[PDB]
Amino acid sequence: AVIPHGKGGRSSVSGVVATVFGATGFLGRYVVNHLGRMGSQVIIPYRCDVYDIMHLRLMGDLGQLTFLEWDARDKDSIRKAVQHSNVVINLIGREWETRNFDFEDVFVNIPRAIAQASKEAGVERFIHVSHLNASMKSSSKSLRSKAVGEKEVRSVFPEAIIIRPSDIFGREDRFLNHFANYRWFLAVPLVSLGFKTVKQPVYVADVSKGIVNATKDPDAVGKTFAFTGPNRYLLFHLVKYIFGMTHRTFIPYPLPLFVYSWIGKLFGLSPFEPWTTKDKVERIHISDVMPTDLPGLEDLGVQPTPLELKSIEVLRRHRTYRWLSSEIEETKPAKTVNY
Amino acid sequence: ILPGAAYTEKSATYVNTEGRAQQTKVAVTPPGLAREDWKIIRALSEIAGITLPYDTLDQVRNRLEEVSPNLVRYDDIEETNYFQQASELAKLVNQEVLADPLVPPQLTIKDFYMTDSISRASQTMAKCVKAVT
Amino acid sequence: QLITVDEKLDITTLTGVPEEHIKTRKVRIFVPARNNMQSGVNNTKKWKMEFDTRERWENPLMGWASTADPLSNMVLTFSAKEDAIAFAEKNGWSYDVEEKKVPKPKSKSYGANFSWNK
Amino acid sequence: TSVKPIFSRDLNEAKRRVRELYRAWYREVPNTVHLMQLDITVKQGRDKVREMFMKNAHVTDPRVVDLLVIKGKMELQETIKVWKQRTHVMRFFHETETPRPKDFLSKFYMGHDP
Amino acid sequence: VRPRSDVTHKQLSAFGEYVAEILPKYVQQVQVSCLDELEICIHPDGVIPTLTFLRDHTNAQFKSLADLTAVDVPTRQNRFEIVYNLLSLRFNSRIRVKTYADELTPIDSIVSVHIAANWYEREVWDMFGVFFFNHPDLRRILTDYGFEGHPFRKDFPLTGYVELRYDDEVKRVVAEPVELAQEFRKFDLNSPWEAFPA
Amino acid sequence: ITHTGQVYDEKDYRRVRFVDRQKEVNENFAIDLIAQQPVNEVEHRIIACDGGGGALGHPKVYINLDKETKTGTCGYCGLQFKQ
Amino acid sequence: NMTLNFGPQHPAAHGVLRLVLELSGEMVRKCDPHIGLLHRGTEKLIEYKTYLQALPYFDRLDYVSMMCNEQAYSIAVEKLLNIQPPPRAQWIRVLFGEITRILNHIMAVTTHALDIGAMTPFFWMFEEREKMFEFYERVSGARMHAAYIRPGGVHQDLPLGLLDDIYEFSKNFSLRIDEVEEMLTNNRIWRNRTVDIGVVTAEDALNYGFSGVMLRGSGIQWDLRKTQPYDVYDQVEFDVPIGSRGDCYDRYLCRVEEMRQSLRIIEQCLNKMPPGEIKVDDAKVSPPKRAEMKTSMESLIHHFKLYTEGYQVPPGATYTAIEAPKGEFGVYLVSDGSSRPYRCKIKAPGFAHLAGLDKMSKGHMLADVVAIIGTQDIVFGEIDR
Amino acid sequence: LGLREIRVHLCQRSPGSQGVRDFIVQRYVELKKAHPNLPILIRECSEVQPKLWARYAFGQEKTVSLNNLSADEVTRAMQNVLS
């Protein structure tokens, strides 16, 4: 262990040495931020070239962030990453099944091997992240596969926390940017005209802070928390609201999903990071599940942050010079649906 | 085990034999999770529900003032004493002084080098002890 | 014309110090003693007021000492006890003055060492 | 006692000036949140103004008050004549820093010196 | 040992008396250092009058302001010691007029007497906190736009209380209380032995 | 390992620093290298070790090799001399 | 008025300058220069550092005239110690002081042209500048930021080949000034860009505390090198290049002349440098020689105390001004009896000059302001300190 | 009311304390003899008027000021405390 000395800011010590395999991610970026702010020792396994992880260097202090070369297929790389970590956090995930990695791999196969080694190593706790409402029978292969994982990893690593976040709201997120980027599309398809798929977003930071707090709290063991949010929404208001802040016309036109799953298939064929995914589409119209579960935010210590509050920052880049100065007050809020 | 500090590591008060109260100053912050002795007990009290009224040193001191005078006035020996009434009660007390000679425990200097905890934990004191022995 | 104020000059509001370090910092006004190593007394002349010592945790990467307290290395020097007390009052720091202790006069005479009976 | 007056002969006259500055800031908060594209709410900001104007509510001496507004006016000038960019303004909100608890038990659990 | 000409210590000394006589309402002390430098000392109210006499007197033309500075003797009731160093290109001599100002007792501004002071007076306010009445535009010059505290005051920590880093979460530079990774080692250097009577 | 037995414990995490990198140490250790040099058998009670090279060496010091049992060692070089 | 700031990254802004300009059309009606972008705390750090360990700071205030800057601190500290440098050292400081004014002027004339748009003069002279730094590096070991001029005397003797090499540089340097002389002194384009721009009247220059080539350019005859001769400037002969009218041309022409006059002073210094010691022989002020500290106890004690504690200069205060290439550079060093200073106000020729930009750049275009900053030779290290 | 301790914080050489100290001199011994276990604490404050602090059971402390009170009033007040 490492006795925590310091005042609490950078150049201080908190005693959490933590491997974080998928740090380069949108959620990840945030996880390393708090861990680094707190003063924790963060080992970031990376596969993308050094150029892309530079954004993580200034976070954390000198000799507090260590970057290791790692390959998912190669078991040895995971082995050495967790050699000297006592906390392992797994954020490995993707939306597009890539040529050399299947949803199973990114969600269930890999995240197993990882926790498996972590145990061999003797890491005190492992945090595994799987998408919210993930039935072993859910339509989207992604969600189901993720469900498959949360089970397995429990056998490789017992009492391994399993936070299960909803789609995340944050700058650089998809949930909010995706819809806002429908601008290019003249019309914005919305299955069931964006109805009956009530959704509860959660700010990225809230998720991050929550995750971090898990690392430094004994109360969470085998817990399957669910960071959800401060307000639910029918996809209709969300879509329009977005377009509202973006100040771009909103033209909700219903599109039969059966045909739309096909549109997802189309972009899905794209070689360079398909923008929409068959598995995405389903997910988007996959209704958010209700909140009866080990609570996440608040329960883990952070009060959720309403979407409207920070939406202005996430959607600003999509506006035009004409609306750049416009502020949240000028715009209207969307409506929640306790349903 | 509730680790505490040592006099190099806290702004506590001590008093020698003629009652001159004196103040240790914090030379080094206490090590590990170890904490100042007064706070461990203020905290245990808050976790118990009888919660000592003092929360900042200056307050623990004000407390010392109500139970005793010397504690708050530093570097100040207390002049008056009441020996005469002490004797009266001594005269009431009847006890036998046993013939066993009264002997100081520190007969020679090896006796002296290691006594308290810090002393006992001293490698320098240990080297001194073996040099004598 | 001058105006009247009985308010102890407190200028804590203008100094620009973070709230935490004005209400939790005790400074001691003391005349420095002499390290017994040297017999010079030129460092036991002026009064100094020194802020209370704070955390000095070891740094993980190089093992250098690291401190989170800004007012640590600051020791202001004041010529007289009255002036130093004034600085604490207007800046709002708590003070606990220690009286100067000067060596008492000691009678010495080389003849004594050759005393018939000492 | 026997002090020379800086700009305000008495707390009364001085308070007049504080009123003016408050108004100034009050009228300005909205503009800044728009010219700096700050992600804050005008109402929220206006409360902050109140916070600061009261953080120094205790001052009783006229001279100290007068300097306080001189300084206050200077800050406004840096924010209406914009020389202070967002990073500077948002700092007022202490958005990134983690708040420290003031509960004794809380401090005991975390810091050697509270 | 430096060569010293007493011609100057006499010339300057005399001038000192001349200034003092001409401006007795404000001159408190007038000394010449052993380094042949005059240093009339004036009551703070004499800032405007003493300077003006030196800027515009045939027998003492002191046209340019070399510098305006404020030492801070914390012990001294009047903390700051505003020092104005002036040069006379006509008589090739410099003089220093030094006054005393406390934190909340402002000094007059001489921007009128010398416009050079427009900037230095802003510099003294930013670093030490002395205020100058009738200044055209007094505002921080050297410190950051949002800086709180006057830095060159002897009571201000060197490292200060705030430092800046870029935070990704908020994608903007953000102050945090200073946390230093090797505190300034404060070597004690004074020797316990004096050098001479001085 | 290092000159002073600086070896991070099997559980310390600064060992992560050495992961995928070389922990810099020097094979040539002084404690040993001085030993190799033999004791100089001078024939005068007090000899001086200028440090070798005069101005390019260490401050000059005189050593008393009078103690028959032990050998004088320059506080600077560590070189030993015996009478 | 379309407020526009000359932001720092722009090349003409010397790296750090935020001139809030009010553009009344292209004509600029007001400038409010926002310096402070390079304030390092140089004068609050010096209070915590001994007199020798604060010398280095003075090489970084104006970073283009290093040694002349460290000749102002060296003269100050020396005054407060009533000690004088040995004769050879004083000539070496005058030799290095004029190499620095040639070095600053090559900096000021060529970078001004870089701003106006002439690019070749910078390249030709900058090769002549590395020839010069070499002289710094060969005498101190640092191309710039030498630390050679010490509070008492200078640090080490000149290497045995430097004065021959300084002759060869000075012998051929004047043709190099002559060459930019032809390329940028009669070009109608330069004259038009520089002549009648930023005229400053004589009394206004004294009142604004300009004190430099800006003072001399408008015809006021003031050189601290002849008026108040510091070091040996009493035994070297030179002509101050007083300009007549004050336009940015007359100021350029003056800067080109001072480079020529400095070659006249450098010539005299090589011709008449005395045999002798380079640092005063008082071990109390200047550190003892390497051989002496390793063979004599009084010298080791003096080396140990001087490096660890300090000179302990006698209590007093002094304002010492030397003619730095930019203008009058002065240090007001207030000293308690302690080995570390109490206050060190660096008067920067430049704090006064930048103040003059608003008055000097009056009724002038956006382009004229680029010339106005160029003709003040402002380095923000000295202004920001 | 369980009485655990009584503290008489008299102030030496103080005008008011005269009564308190007189009590100590004349009746302290007696009180102790009577109550030979109870701890009666004679302590010496300064620049404070005398206070007869009493600690009752379960950490409750009560205060009776003795400023400028006669010797028997001090005796009566003390007797009222241990009822």
Ligand SMILES: NC(=O)C1=CN([C@@H]2O[C@H](COP(=O)(O)OP(=O)(O)OC[C@H]3O[C@@H](n4cnc5c(N)ncnc54)[C@H](OP(=O)(O)O)[C@@H]3O)[C@@H](O)[C@H]2O)C=CC1
């Ligand atoms: N809206 C959301 O973001 C939600 C996310 N989640 C879960 O949270 C986790 C983090 O999400 P997010 O950050 O958006 O995901 P990202 O798409 O940002 O990717 C996360 C990280 O996983 C790494 N990664 C992906 N595939 C592989 C692979 N085959 N081998 C090695 N590394 C890989 C990536 O590294 P690289 O880029 O270098 O390949 C990346 O740094 C995910 O696992 C997801 O299941 C759950 C609910 C909502």
Ligand SMILES: COC1=C(OC)C(=O)C(CC=C(C)C)=C(C)C1=O
């Ligand atoms: C000579 O004066 C100065 C310049 O202008 C010619 C600058 O460009 C710069 C900075 C320029 C760059 C972009 C290297 C500095 C520091 C300077 O001192």
Ligand SMILES: [Zn+2]
């Ligand atoms: Zn040797």
